[PDB]
Design a protein around this ligand. Structure first.
Ligand SMILES: N#Cc1ccc(Cn2cnc3ccccc32)cc1
Ligand SMILES: *[C@@H]1O[C@H](CO)[C@@H](O)[C@H](O)[C@H]1NC(C)=O
Length: 345
C-alpha cells in the first residue's frame, strides 16, 4: 500500500480549493523513483466543470480521498507483478485539476475553480526531496491517458526544476502511456476546439521550445504527442495502442459488421499512428483496441514481436547506461485490431 500525504503548501490545490497531495511507498534500498500521473479526461468551461463536480468529484477534490491505495502494475512492489521496477520508490499523484496537468491558476473572486496541474507536480517534487528523492539516480515521470499527455507537457520542466535546485545528478526521464493522440478528421462530424478553450480557461502552460515554435494562440498544438515530442530533451518512452479507445471515441467510431468506409478509416488510423512513431526510438505500440496499460495488473501479458512491455522498459534502462535481443522500438505492422494475438481480451 502507498500512504496519502496532503501537500504542506496548502496554496497548491485541487479544483475546489482542497489541498492536493500524493501517495508514497518508500524503498530505502533503492535510488530509483517512479512518479505516476493519473488520468481522466478534463473539463473546459464552467458548466462542464460543474457537471464533473457532481459525479466525478474525486477528480476535482481531496475531501473524500482514502488514506491508502494499492500499488498495481508498474507501481506494484512484487517481482511477479512488476518485473521492471519492483524495488523502486513508488509515488501515485492523483489527478484533481482537470487540466491535463497544464494549469497554473488559483481559485479567486474571478475563478470558481483552481487549475494547478503543472504546479502540483512541481510541489510534489519539492516535498519529496526532503523524504529521500535528494538521493536518487533516476526519476521516471510516468502517466496514463491525460496523465500520459501530462508527462509530455511536464518532463522537461521537472528536469529544469531539479537542475536549478542544485541536483544535476538526478536523471529525469518520461513514460507516456495512452497519451499520444492524433488531431485527425473524425469518422462522423471538434476536439481541438475544446483543448484551445481549455488552455485559456486554465491559464495552461506548455513546454517552452514547443511554445516558441507554434506561438501565441496556437499552444493547443503542444498537447499532441507527434508535435511536442520532437521539442523535448529528456528521454521519453511512448506506449500507445494503435487503435486507442479514447481516440476512436473522439473520432465517433463505435464497434459487429464493418463496411468498406469504416474499414478504410480504421486501417488509415493505424497507419497514421504507426507513421508518427517511426522516428521515436523508445516506443511500444501494439495493434489492439484498448486504453491504458501500465498500472493494470496484467500489463505483463502483451507482447510485440515476442517482447513484453516490462522487458522493453528494462532494455531502455540498459540503452541509457543497440542491444542484442533487447529491443527498445516495438511497433506492430499488422493493420487491424487484434491482429496481435497477445492483445487484452
Ligand atoms: N482532436 C482531438 C483529440 C482530443 C482528445 C483526445 C483524447 N484525450 C483524452 N484526454 C486527453 C488529454 C489531452 C489530449 C487529448 C486527450 C484525443 C484526440
Ligand atoms: C506555495 O505554492 C505557491 C504556488 O506555487 C508558491 O507561490 C508559494 O511560494 C509556495 N510557498 C512556499 C512556502 O514555498
Amino acid at each position: 500500500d502507498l500512504r496519502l500525504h496532503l501537500l504542506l503548501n496548502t496554496s497548491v490545490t485541487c479544483n475546489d480549493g482542497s489541498p492536493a497531495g500524493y501517495y508514497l511507498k518508500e524503498s530505502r534500498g533503492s535510488r530509483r523513483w517512479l512518479l505516476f500521473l493519473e488520468g481522466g479526461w478534463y473539463c473546459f468551461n464552467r458548466e462542464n466543470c460543474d457537471s464533473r463536480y457532481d459525479t466525478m468529484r474525486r477528480l476535482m477534490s481531496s475531501r473524500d480521498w482514502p488514506r491508502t491505495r494499492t500499488g498495481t502494475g508498474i507501481l506494484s512492489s512484487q517481482p511477479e507483478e512488476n518485473p521492471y521496477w519492483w524495488n523502486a520508490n513508488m509515488v501515485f499523484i492523483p489527478y484533481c485539476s482537470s487540466d491535463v496537468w497544464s494549469g497554473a491558476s488559483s481559485k479567486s473572486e474571478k475563478n470558481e475553480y483552481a487549475f494547478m496541474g503543472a504546479l502540483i507536480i512541481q510541489e510534489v517534487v519539492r516535498e519529496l526531496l526532503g523524504r529521500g528523492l535528494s538521493g536518487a539516480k533516476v526519476l521516471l515521470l510516468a502517466g496514463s491517458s491525460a496523465g500520459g499527455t501530462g508527462v509530455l507537457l511536464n518532463v522537461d520542466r521537472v528536469a529544469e526544476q531539479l537542475e536549478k535546485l542544485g541536483y544535476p545528478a538526478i536523471q529525469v526521464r518520461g513514460l507516456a502511456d495512452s497519451g499520444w493522440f492524433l488531431d485527425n478528421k473524425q469518422y462522423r462530424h471538434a476536439p481541438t476546439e475544446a483543448i484551445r478553450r481549455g488552455i485559456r480557461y486554465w491559464n495552461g502552460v506548455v513546454p517552452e521550445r514547443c511554445r516558441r515554435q507554434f506561438q501565441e494562440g496556437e499552444e493547443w498544438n503542444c498537447f499532441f504527442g507527434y508535435k511536442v515530442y520532437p521539442t523535448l530533451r529528456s528521454p521519453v518512452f511512448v506506449v500507445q495502442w494503435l487503435f486507442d479507445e479514447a481516440q476512436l471515441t473522439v473520432d465517433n467510431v463505435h464497434l459487429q459488421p464493418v463496411q468498406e468506409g469504416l474499414r478504410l478509416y480504421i486501417q488509415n488510423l493505424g497507419r497514421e499512428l504507426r507513421h508518427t512513431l517511426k522516428d521515436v526510438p523508445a516506443s511500444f505500440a501494439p495493434a489492439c483496441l484498448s486504453h491504458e496499460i501500465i498500472i493494470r495488473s496484467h500489463w505483463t501479458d502483451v507482447q510485440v514481436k515476442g517482447t513484453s512491455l516490462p522487458r522493453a522498459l528494462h532494455c531502455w534502462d540498459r540503452s541509457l547506461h543497440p542491444l542484442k535481443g533487447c529491443p527498445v522500438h516495438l511497433v506492430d505492422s499488422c493493420p487491424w485490431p487484434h491482429c496481435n494475438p497477445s492483445c487484452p481480451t
